[PDB]
Amino acid sequence: MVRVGMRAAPRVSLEALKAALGGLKLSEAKVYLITDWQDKRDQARYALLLHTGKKDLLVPDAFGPAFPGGEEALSELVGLLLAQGARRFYEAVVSPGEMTALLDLPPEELLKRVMAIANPTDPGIYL
Amino acid sequence: MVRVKVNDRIVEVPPGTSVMDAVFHAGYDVPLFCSEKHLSPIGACRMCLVRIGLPIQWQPKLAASCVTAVADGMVVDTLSDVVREAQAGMVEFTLLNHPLDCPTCDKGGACELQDRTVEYGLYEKYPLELPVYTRFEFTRRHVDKHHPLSPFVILDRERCIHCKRCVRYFEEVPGDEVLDFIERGVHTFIGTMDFGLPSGFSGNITDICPVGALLDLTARFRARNWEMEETPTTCALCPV
Amino acid sequence: MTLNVGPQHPSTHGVLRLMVTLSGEEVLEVVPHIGYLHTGFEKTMEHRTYLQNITYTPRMDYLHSFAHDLAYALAVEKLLGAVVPPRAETIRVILNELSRLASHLVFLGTGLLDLGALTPFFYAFRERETILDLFEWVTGQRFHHNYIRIGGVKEDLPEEFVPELKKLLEVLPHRIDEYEALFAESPIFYERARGVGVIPPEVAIDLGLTGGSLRASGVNYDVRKAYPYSGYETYTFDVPLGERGDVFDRMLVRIREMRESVKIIKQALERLEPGPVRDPNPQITPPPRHLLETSMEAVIYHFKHYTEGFHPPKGEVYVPTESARGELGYYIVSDGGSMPYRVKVRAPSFVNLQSLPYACKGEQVPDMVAIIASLDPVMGDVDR
Amino acid sequence: MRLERVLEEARAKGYPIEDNGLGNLWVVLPRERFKEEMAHYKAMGFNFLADIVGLDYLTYPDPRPERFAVVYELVSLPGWKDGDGSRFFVRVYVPEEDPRLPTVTDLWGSANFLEREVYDLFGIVFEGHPDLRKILTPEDLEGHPLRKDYPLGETPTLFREGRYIIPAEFRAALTGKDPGLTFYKGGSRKGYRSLW
Amino acid sequence: ASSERELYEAWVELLSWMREYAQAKGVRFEKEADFPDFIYRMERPYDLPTTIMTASLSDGLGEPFLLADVSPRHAKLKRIGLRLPRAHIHLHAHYEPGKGLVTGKIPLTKERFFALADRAREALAFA
Amino acid sequence: REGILFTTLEKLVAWGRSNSLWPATFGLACCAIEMMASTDARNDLARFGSEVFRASPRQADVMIVAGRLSKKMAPVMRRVWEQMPDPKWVISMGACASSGGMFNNYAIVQNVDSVVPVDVYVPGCPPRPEALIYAVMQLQKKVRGQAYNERGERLPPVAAWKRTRG
Amino acid sequence: TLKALAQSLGITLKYLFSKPVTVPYPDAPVALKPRFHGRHVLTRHPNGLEKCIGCSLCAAACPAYAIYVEPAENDPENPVSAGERYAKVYEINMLRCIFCGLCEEACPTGAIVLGYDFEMADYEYSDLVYGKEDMLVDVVGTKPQRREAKRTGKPVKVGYVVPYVRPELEGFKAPTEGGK
Numbered sequence A: 001m002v003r004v005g006m007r008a009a010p011r012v013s014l015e016a017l018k019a020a021l022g023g024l025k026l027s028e029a030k031v032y033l034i035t036d037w038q039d040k041r042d043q044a045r046y047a048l049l050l051h052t053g054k055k056d057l058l059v060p061d062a063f064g065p066a067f068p069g070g071e072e073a074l075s076e077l078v079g080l081l082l083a084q085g086a087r088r089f090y091e092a093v094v095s096p097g098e099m100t101a102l103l104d105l106p107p108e109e110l111l112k113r114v115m116a117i118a119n120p121t122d123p124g125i126y127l
Numbered sequence B: 001m002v003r004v005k006v007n008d009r010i011v012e013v014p015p016g017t018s019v020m021d022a023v024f025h026a027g028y029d030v031p032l033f034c035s036e037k038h039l040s041p042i043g044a045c046r047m048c049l050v051r052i053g054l055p056i057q058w059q060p061k062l063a064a065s066c067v068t069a070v071a072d073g074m075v076v077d078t079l080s081d082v083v084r085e086a087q088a089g090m091v092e093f094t095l096l097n098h099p100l101d102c103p104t105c106d107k108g109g110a111c112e113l114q115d116r117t118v119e120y121g122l123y124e125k126y127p128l129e130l131p132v133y134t135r136f137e138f139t140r141r142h143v144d145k146h147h148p149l150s151p152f153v154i155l156d157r158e159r160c161i162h163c164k165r166c167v168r169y170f171e172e173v174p175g176d177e178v179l180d181f182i183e184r185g186v187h188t189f190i191g192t193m194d195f196g197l198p199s200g201f202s203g204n205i206t207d208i209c210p211v212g213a214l215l216d217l218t219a220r221f222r223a224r225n226w227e228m229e230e231t232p233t234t235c236a237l238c239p240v
Numbered sequence C: 001m002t003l004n005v006g007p008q009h010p011s012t013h014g015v016l017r018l019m020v021t022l023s024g025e026e027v028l029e030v031v032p033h034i035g036y037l038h039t040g041f042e043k044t045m046e047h048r049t050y051l052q053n054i055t056y057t058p059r060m061d062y063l064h065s066f067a068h069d070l071a072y073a074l075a076v077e078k079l080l081g082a083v084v085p086p087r088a089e090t091i092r093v094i095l096n097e098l099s100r101l102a103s104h105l106v107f108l109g110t111g112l113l114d115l116g117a118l119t120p121f122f123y124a125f126r127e128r129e130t131i132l133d134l135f136e137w138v139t140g141q142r143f144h145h146n147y148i149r150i151g152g153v154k155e156d157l158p159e160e161f162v163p164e165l166k167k168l169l170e171v172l173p174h175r176i177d178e179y180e181a182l183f184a185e186s187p188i189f190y191e192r193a194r195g196v197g198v199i200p201p202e203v204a205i206d207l208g209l210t211g212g213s214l215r216a217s218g219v220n221y222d223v224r225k226a227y228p229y230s231g232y233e234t235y236t237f238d239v240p241l242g243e244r245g246d247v248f249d250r251m252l253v254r255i256r257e258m259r260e261s262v263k264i265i266k267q268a269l270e271r272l273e274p275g276p277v278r279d280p281n282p283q284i285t286p287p288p289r290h291l292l293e294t295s296m297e298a299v300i301y302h303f304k305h306y307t308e309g310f311h312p313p314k315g316e317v318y319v320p321t322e323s324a325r326g327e328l329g330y331y332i333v334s335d336g337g338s339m340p341y342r343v344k345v346r347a348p349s350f351v352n353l354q355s356l357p358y359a360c361k362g363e364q365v366p367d368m369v370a371i372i373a374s375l376d377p378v379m380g381d382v383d384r
Numbered sequence D: 001m002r003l004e005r006v007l008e009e010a011r012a013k014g015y016p017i018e019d020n021g022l023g024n025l026w027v028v029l030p031r032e033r034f035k036e037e038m039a040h041y042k043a044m045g046f047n048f049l050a051d052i053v054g055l056d057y058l059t060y061p062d063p064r065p066e067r068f069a070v071v072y073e074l075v076s077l078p079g080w081k082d083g084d085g086s087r088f089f090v091r092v093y094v095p096e097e098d099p100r101l102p103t104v105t106d107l108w109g110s111a112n113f114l115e116r117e118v119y120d121l122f123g124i125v126f127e128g129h130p131d132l133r134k135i136l137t138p139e140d141l142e143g144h145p146l147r148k149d150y151p152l153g154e155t156p157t158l159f160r161e162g163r164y165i166i167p168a169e170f171r172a173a174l175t176g177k178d179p180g181l182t183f184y185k186g187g188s189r190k191g192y193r194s195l196w
Numbered sequence E: 001a002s003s004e005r006e007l008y009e010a011w012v013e014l015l016s017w018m019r020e021y022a023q024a025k026g027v028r029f030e031k032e033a034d035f036p037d038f039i040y041r042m043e044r045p046y047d048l049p050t051t052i053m054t055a056s057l058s059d060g061l062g063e064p065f066l067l068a069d070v071s072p073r074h075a076k077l078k079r080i081g082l083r084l085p086r087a088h089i090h091l092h093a094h095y096e097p098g099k100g101l102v103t104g105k106i107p108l109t110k111e112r113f114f115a116l117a118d119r120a121r122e123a124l125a126f127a
Numbered sequence F: 001r002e003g004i005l006f007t008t009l010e011k012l013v014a015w016g017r018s019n020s021l022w023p024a025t026f027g028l029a030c031c032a033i034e035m036m037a038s039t040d041a042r043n044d045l046a047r048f049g050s051e052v053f054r055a056s057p058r059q060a061d062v063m064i065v066a067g068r069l070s071k072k073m074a075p076v077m078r079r080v081w082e083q084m085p086d087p088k089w090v091i092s093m094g095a096c097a098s099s100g101g102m103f104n105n106y107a108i109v110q111n112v113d114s115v116v117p118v119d120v121y122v123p124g125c126p127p128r129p130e131a132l133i134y135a136v137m138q139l140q141k142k143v144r145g146q147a148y149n150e151r152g153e154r155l156p157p158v159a160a161w162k163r164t165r166g
Numbered sequence G: 001t002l003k004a005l006a007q008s009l010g011i012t013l014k015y016l017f018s019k020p021v022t023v024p025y026p027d028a029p030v031a032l033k034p035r036f037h038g039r040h041v042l043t044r045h046p047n048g049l050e051k052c053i054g055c056s057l058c059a060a061a062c063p064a065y066a067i068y069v070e071p072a073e074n075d076p077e078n079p080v081s082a083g084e085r086y087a088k089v090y091e092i093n094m095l096r097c098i099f100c101g102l103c104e105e106a107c108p109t110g111a112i113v114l115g116y117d118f119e120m121a122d123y124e125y126s127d128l129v130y131g132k133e134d135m136l137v138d139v140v141g142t143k144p145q146r147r148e149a150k151r152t153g154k155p156v157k158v159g160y161v162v163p164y165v166r167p168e169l170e171g172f173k174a175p176t177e178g179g180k
């Protein structure tokens, strides 16, 4: 599993994600938008874990309107995932103390935890 | 090495082993107030009492297993009905004068007294007979409350059960005799004329006190022990 | 026609998916699909103190929940040997038979509405409200009531409970006899139920169809007689049975079960003498609320019990009971900790549902609805 | 009655008999003898198969032979042809890296769904099953929930201003291996049982 | 009997006395401990006039020099007790009707209490 | 055309949509029986305009999420929600739907607002039937445009108008 | 058995002319039993001191984990609780609360005790976290009810009636049997 981007850099993370994504077919891939604070999406921050099934991709807490211009990047991101054929969007809610350490856990622990705790999400809430 | 038997089990053990330690080493258990890791044991709480056979020749009176040495091939009984009877009795004596502050006690669930009491107290006396918790219906001991001994340490002299952990520590471990009793009998209470707590190792008694007498003032009234999110790590202020 | 009667549609109670293999208007065979409600009680229960799990017990089989409450209580008690006072046990069996009445009321209302006319859903369900009022009197809750405890019950009955209950015990026999007069001499329900639903007792046994429809196939297999636990040994009891497993005999047996349940309610309430309400052993029961201002030991036991709870011995346990849907039990593995090591539920409707492809095989497409309703499934029980 | 004959049959066969003082009986059969023994058990007249309960003994304080343990429940209906009422359990341990067990589909069709649940909840594959299709958990779910190494997946409870709770670090109740907030657990909180 | 009431009533008076001394000599008086059968009474009735059971007169350093306690609502052998810390000095006051508050047979006058507290101030207090 | 563009006409159609709430039955769990009891012959949700009950999603506007929304039911419900006419409202019934309830685990969506735009939330376990009537009255005055939150904001008549569904 | 159709007609008509049975909520107040599990209340002593001594037992015994208690030390000059400890922050998420009664059963001072109100539906998640000053016994009504009384100018009307309020609810204001 790869880790691209950096914290709190929506544009850098997004452009690196465009480049590294390429023409990957997401017909059976899974997108986990991990965030904190279930309700307040107005100031929410978002991290992304993309499980393709053959290899996985991590982007830390660098998306969301909590960062200046993060919502526009998140909009392009969800539009991109929807274009490539994604159907299954998920949101995992972790404690802020978790989000930061979670990206330092081994791939198996992070991925198992996230796939276990996921909440099915309507992608429309992030567009 | 030396052979010991705990109630059904046989243990090899080096000679200098305390009967209490060998008991725990066999997986058994016994209340514990007087003795502590790395502290000089003295039979004070009289909680560690077990049965000892030294031949089947039971000791005449119960031996203090916290400060009683071991001999090769010695029998130890911690499950005799009389044993649990005596342990519950000692626990009741200890709980006699506590101030009834558990709900507002910042030591909360992590009170050795609470756990040993919920373990060994109230042996099934012999139906659905109405049980009574306490028999002592007199007035309890009341002394000065929540006295900050130092900008770091709070002292509630009521909750003390008069063990020796804090004064024994202060004499042995730092070598700074800045805490000891005042009176004797039941009126005994802790005091000092060295108030600033000069020893730079004062805070550790905060953890040792099996009751909520000595607490960490800087963490007073924040949360209960089980509520706090525990992360073990290492302090990098200095190289040790 | 591999037709997908999808989840929840058309108004298929007990969210369920059915792939009806079917050519025409018959029913070749229905492939069921369940799992649409699996919440993980067997898992979440491993993380709640013994006292707390009583909050997880009723909400699974949300119609006849007191069977859950009592089975879990008995399993834990046997694990630690607690004694339920006779008055507590009697109140428990009263509430058990009462929730049985409410469950059967809801079952037959749902069934009658499922295919045919809507009206009789109300009257029976009406009584449920009255019954619920009764429960609201004692437990303060309509259902999902948290009343039972390991030693016994939470607290005592008010003076106001018995009169309302007698009033209902007076109206219920006439009410049930009215429904039966409506039903037994069935004009169309006869040609709708008597023939349908082939239940060969051999197959009902091989699939373990315990949910009261086995005795419609003529097997007198009830725990209340087979394995007396809560004093049923001390009750004047009719155990209804059916001659041939069909819908009609099923429904008649359930109605006679309701009347006998009312008779059991009368019997239990009549023998009611003052006494205590739960096992006062402090490890097992929290301290009485009045001496919290007298004893240190009181505060210690209250605090520890309501934070940690108690630690039963290392061991595994099971006790069965008879639900409105058949044999129930909890396989409880305790590891000597304050929380159970594992809690597995023998879900009667879960094993009972295996008989759907057989039952509805060759029946009509509309009758696939009644033949489900005749089984009285509760998918909170099945998916679990 | 047939339970007593099971006892007199198995005890001579060297099968240990586990019993607690509550009235429940366990008969431990090894892997091989399991299938033919239980075929005989049905032949002995054991019509009714109540439960197939899967167990993960990983986090049990005392160790056990194997991680997984599957228990079947065999009964004889009292009101049928020859009704004794004998009900008892058969436990069979299953290796962590060899989750094999032949099905009893040939004997009972009831184990059709039940075994599937264990393949859903545990990594146990039941050989000889008609269709091992995931019953309860979503189709795209990866893993087997009830085994202890599978997270429960708790989500914090929320409040007004940044104040939250993570339950697994919040729970005060102790499991078997959690020594507690004091130095240890002894006495009643290492196991307590009243004597009637 | 019911003298308990006046006892508690007289107890209040004692506390009153205490407060006066503190206000005169400019020494901190502190409410040490309240009644448990009043904190832990949930629906239960409470008839006592006050909620306070134990109090003290503390020096600048916080070490008390005069301690006073009264027996609870439900305890046997109801009394009032007095103590001087560090001085092995203990007093058992009762209340006898008609006479008044008594140390044994010696009535307890306000000025007696003042003399004891002044002696304590001069002697025991460190600062 | 969306029920707008005349001060009287929008009041009128909002009035109509408010009292003509046509429920779409989506029973999930034990909330469902206390939902149905809001229609029994002690307490009927059959007066305000909700007597008839179109199980079809093509004919009913209010979707009462009564019970725990298990994840394997989430996407299905998804399309079921999109299989409603656009003038539709979505009430989240029970604790398990509104919040995660006591089932804080891998199996349940911890707030149904994730998949569907929630109009009204109703705590309770189970919510007393009269609380369900109170929730539909809350939704009533919401779709009339007569509803304000704790922060002073007026809420839109129809939630699920503000989401770029796709 | 053709007679049964006629009998069905007959019984349906008999119930037709039996007009009454129903209650038109909110027009008619629902009769609630005195033991009902409702909106939590924080109770006060006669002295005016609040009963909560902030002991976090309600939060520890909460099987849904909806109770958060930030504690603080009583100010002896103006105390709030009866002991040396009080609850600076007591928030309860009604969406998490499953209405057990364990908080009441553990509260040693009888501070947190379930009430009776059920008309608590609101529109926004973050608004359904009821606060201490939104549940104190001093208050009359639920949050949406109070907000409607502000935005409406119309006083609070409770939609329930009970035969009586329990002793454990001392102070709890409710309609009582019709004495008023």
Ligand SMILES: CC(C)(C)c1ccc(CSc2cnn(C(C)(C)C)c(=O)c2Cl)cc1
Residues within 6 Å of the ligand: C011, C012, C013, C014, C015, C110, C377, C378, C379, C380, F025, F026, F027, F028, F029, F032, F036, F039, F053
């Ligand atoms: C028309 C009414 C409102 C009466 C109606 C509304 C909704 C349904 C389908 S939901 C449903 C219904 N009953 N059950 C039981 C527990 C009885 C099996 C369920 O488990 C589920 Cl999930 C049916 C009828």
Ligand code: SF4
Residues within 6 Å of the ligand: B159, B160, B161, B162, B163, B164, B165, B166, B167, B190, B208, B209, B210, B211, B213, B214
């Ligand atoms: S203050 Fe604590 S550590 Fe010191 S003697 Fe008393 S109980 Fe022991």
Ligand code: SF4
Residues within 6 Å of the ligand: B098, B099, B100, B101, B102, B103, B105, B106, B107, B108, B109, B111, B113, B114, B159, B210, B211, B212, B213
């Ligand atoms: S020291 Fe222990 S027994 Fe005393 S109040 Fe605190 S928790 Fe309770």
Ligand code: SF4
Residues within 6 Å of the ligand: C059, C144, F029, F030, F031, F066, F067, F068, F093, F094, F095, F096, F097, F101, F124, F125, F126, F127
């Ligand atoms: S809130 Fe309660 S009644 Fe509703 S679905 Fe959840 S457990 Fe069932």
Ligand code: SF4
Residues within 6 Å of the ligand: G058, G061, G062, G063, G064, G065, G066, G067, G092, G096, G097, G098, G099, G100, G101, G102, G103, G104
């Ligand atoms: S009733 Fe509510 S606040 Fe009280 S213990 Fe239950 S979930 Fe927690």
Ligand code: SF4
Residues within 6 Å of the ligand: B103, G051, G052, G053, G054, G055, G056, G057, G058, G059, G069, G087, G103, G106, G107, G108, G109, G110, G111, G112
């Ligand atoms: S249990 Fe009662 S006294 Fe304790 S914190 Fe909760 S409300 Fe306060």
Ligand code: FES
Residues within 6 Å of the ligand: B031, B032, B033, B034, B035, B042, B043, B044, B045, B046, B047, B048, B049, B064, B065, B066, B067
């Ligand atoms: S343990 Fe203290 S006396 Fe031995």
